[PDB]
Design a protein around this ligand. Structure first.
Ligand SMILES: CCNC(=O)c1cc(-c2cn(C)nn2)nc([C@@H](C)c2ccccc2)c1
Length: 112
């Protein structure tokens, strides 16, 4: 039941990250980065493993994640992609930092 319990905590975090409470800074992470639409023609040369909250949601719904660690690896991959691609002074990086702070502090309260 630990794995079930821990994955329910993960699902709770995911719902929070997608909630109106965090929408002001979470919105760039809702859907896959559309590189063409944003004119980011080097995005897929720099980012080899794209990740976003809609993909995390699909994987949770599909029971793709077997444990909390696998879930956290995708959420952190999403933030890492943002920190790798973008100049550190871009607004999206500040938004990533703020959403990661929400993630890390609640992920840390994982039930044992
Ligand atoms: C190298 C310069 N970067 C961009 O032009 C850029 C990158 C991203 C982005 C999204 N993710 C998940 N990673 N990167 N998003 C925007 C847009 C949507 C935007 C504009 C204003 C504030 C917040 C985001 C612009």
């Amino acid at each position: 039941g630990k794995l079930s319990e821990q994955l329910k905590h993960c699902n709770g975090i995911l719902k929070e990250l997608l909630s109106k409470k965090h929408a002001a800074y979470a919105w760039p992470f809702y859907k896959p980065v559309d590189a063409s639409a944003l004119g980011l023609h080097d995005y897929h040369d720099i980012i080899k493993h794209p990740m976003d909250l809609s993909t995390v949601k699909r994987k949770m719904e599909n029971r793709d994640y077997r444990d909390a660690q696998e879930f956290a690896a995708d959420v952190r991959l999403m933030f890492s992609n943002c920190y790798k691609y973008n100049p550190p002074d871009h607004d999206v990086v500040a938004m990533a930092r703020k959403l990661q702070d929400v993630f890390e502090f609640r992920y840390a309260k994982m039930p044992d």
